[PDB]
Amino acid sequence: LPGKLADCQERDPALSELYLVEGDSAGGSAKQGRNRKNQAILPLKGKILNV
DNA sequence: GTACCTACGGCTTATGATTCTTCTCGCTTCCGGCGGCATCGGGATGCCCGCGTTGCAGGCCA
């Protein structure tokens, strides 16, 4: 929960949005240019192992 | 693709210590009430006489 996740002010689901981008390259400007009402961004690190 | 360490210098803020404010234990002993009796100075009551109080009308003041 800490570290990377930055939720919005609203807590009721089906109203907010979630995004998945590169952390240090994209998430910075994404948070600096997003809204603080119904916006949430979850950064990522590199790739993800296959299933 | 990403994280964690200290030196170079200054103000502050996050917590254990010391002088100033205060809360009130101890009773006991010199001292302060407390009551009774002889004493003394004041005054209320009475009479006399002149002065303090008040009403009228005028000139001065806030």
Side-chain angles (χ1 to χ4, degrees), chain A residues 1-34:
Chain A
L1 183 63
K4 298 293 183 182
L5 183 63
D7 61 357
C8 64
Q9 293 179 356
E10 183 66 26
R11 294 179 66 188
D12 190 359
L15 189 151
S16 66
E17 293 179 353
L18 183 62
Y19 294 100
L20 294 174
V21 298
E22 184 178 1
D24 186 74
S25 179
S29 66
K31 292 181 181 179
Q32 292 179 356
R34 66 178 176 87

